[PDB]
Amino acid sequence: PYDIAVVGMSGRFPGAPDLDAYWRLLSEGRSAIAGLLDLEGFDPGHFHLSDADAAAMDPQALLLLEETLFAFCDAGYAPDELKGRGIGVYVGGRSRGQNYLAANLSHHFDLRGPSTVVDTACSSALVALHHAAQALRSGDVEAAVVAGVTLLPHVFDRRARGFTPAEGVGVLLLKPLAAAEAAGDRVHAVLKGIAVNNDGRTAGPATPNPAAQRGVMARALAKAGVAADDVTYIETNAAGSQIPDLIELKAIAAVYRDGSDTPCSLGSVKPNIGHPQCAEGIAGVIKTVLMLRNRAIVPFLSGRQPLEHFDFAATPLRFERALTPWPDAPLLAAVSSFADGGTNAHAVLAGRGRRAPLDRPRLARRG
Amino acid sequence: PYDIAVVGMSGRFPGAPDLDAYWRLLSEGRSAIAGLLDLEGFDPGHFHLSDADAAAMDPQALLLLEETLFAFCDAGYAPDELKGRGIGVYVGGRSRGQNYLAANLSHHFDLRGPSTVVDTACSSALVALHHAAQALRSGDVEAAVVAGVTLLPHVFDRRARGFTPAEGVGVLLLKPLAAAEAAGDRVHAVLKGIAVNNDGRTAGPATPNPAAQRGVMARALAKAGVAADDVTYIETNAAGSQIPDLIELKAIAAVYRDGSDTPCSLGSVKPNIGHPQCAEGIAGVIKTVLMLRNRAIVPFLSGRQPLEHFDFAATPLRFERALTPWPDAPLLAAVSSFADGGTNAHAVLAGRGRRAPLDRPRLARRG
């Protein structure tokens, strides 16, 4: 059981230019769909880039540079304090030299840990989180940047048709918990366990493997060392289609509430911000970290037409409709991402100080 | 110190249709350049693929399917014995859904571990090896397939101009050593330690960071728990350009032979088969595994015009010109890959039974 602190974070999502706005959006139960970032250009100069360099780069890379800078600000570290250090960079995102999304960050901030990009569709950011946790657990890095990014070139419910594709970016700075506590870092939440697996041989692309969904969740729980009943909230995969959604709900019940009546609260960001593809996992993780930090459960928007082969009155699974203070139950939450490609991931996070956030520099943006 | 057995392997390189031919090529000191595989088509049917499916797939994927099958044969496992198991797939290769190189394997062989592709240029296969070792060390998989693949769309020496681009593929099956020993698996060699890092902020693309090259090698050695003097042979990065080659040789001396006169034998496959891009690391690892298994050092082909700012008569570094039995020194070797992109990797391997290889099925190939 190897505890990893989230010592800093930043992000940007539809209807939410920074994490305070993201928290307002989610906690008020607002939707920015009913899915683009309103980018106002970039400041290449701040990053030692020319306008020509910037015009030839993938804009996802420029956005990651800003947001990584802002995550360092949130953690209370200036870039000069991080340069030259053994810090890994793990990015979930789709490239348009294929590693450039991670390598730009390592180059600009002079980070010397492994620098890797993964693309496993909606699970990409959770898979990047898993590479970071393995690196931290093995002592290969002292800290890790984990990000998800996507810029574009109804669920648990009978009207479910898949979502509006959306944009988004999120960045976490991670360190081993004992190291964070000794340095006086901010600790927004603790990652207790994360697991990844694959569906294997299935009949086709959108055909889920229920056993693999159970397995990845049971594995993350085992790594976390926590009782299933202690996990109070799950940010679900929320595929938005009856068969996989039903499969998901039964798999949650089987793993988390087998022979139990303890309430389990389920949610999803997708009705609030759409489906941010490679950034989906990171939107979910940031939501959950914010919930744990503020000790509150945010409203779930959809679910308003229950599925046909699932009794929501024989299970203790439920959907919160209001902003509520955390129930009388442990500060533990989980996040799932089960991608059509075959890859599944599931993470377990826990709630629970004196380095102060730095102000974000004022960037001078142009297109 | 976590020991990982290579329990099976297969591969194909210029002038070498299988590993026995590869060993003949290397041990005789032959060159297939002075860089294409002579592919005779594929057998889609054997893999439950139609000709139309196969014609629309990346041929690197079809080649990986064959070679993974052949690595399982070499390990003595039929596919039916591996299906459904917690086996990860880690592929170094450049995709033309970006994870398809790994996902095809997981799908076809029904492997349920994480399935990931990495592209960090020449270090891709060593980076994939590092993800596999982390997964095995953390108990996330019981075994791992690691591959490198490239199909195309003078060194330590004054004539050095970079190499002929080349094709290649290699696949390893890995398990924890104690598990391999208990199951009676073949053990071709043991991976003792592997490390990855990044150059960070450099003046430009082909500008090496000597401190990062020292650091990645010193880290792999520390993870391996072995004395530097016990490593007898290094398959070098061998960039093929005076400045990085000189940097490499000084970094080897500083890390491996600091205050020591113990001989250290250096080599490279690149004069034999060219530069197989994403498969470079895997060609190097397979070479070294074969050397350790046969207890022999193969000839080095180039180095015949020493560099201008390096005394090859004050260091104990040397280049073997003949096939020689292993010297009177431990059966330990290392492999480096330092990519222009920023990524460096270094692995340490050791030499040292009754499951028998299966015959390769006869595939019926067509274009």
Give your account of this protein's structure.
The structure is a homodimer of 367-residue chains. Chain A is α/β, with parallel strands linked by helices and 367 residues long. Chain A has a single domain (1-367), classed as Peroxisomal Thiolase, Chain A, domain 1 (3-Layer(aba) Sandwich). In chain A, 31% of the residues lie in helices and 20% in strands. In chain A, strands 3-2-4-5-1-6-13-12-7-8-10 form an 11-stranded mixed beta sheet, sandwiched between helices. In chain A, strands 9-11 form a two-stranded antiparallel sheet. In chain A, a hairpin with a 4-residue loop joins strand 12 (332-338) and strand 13 (343-350). In chain A, helix 1 crosses helix 10 (280-294). The longest helix of chain A is centred in the N-terminal third of the chain and has 17 residues, at 59-75. The radius of gyration of chain A is 19 Å and the shape is globular. At the A-B interface, helix 4, strand 3, helix 5, strand 6 and helix 7 of A face helix 4, strand 3, helix 5, strand 6 and helix 7 of B.
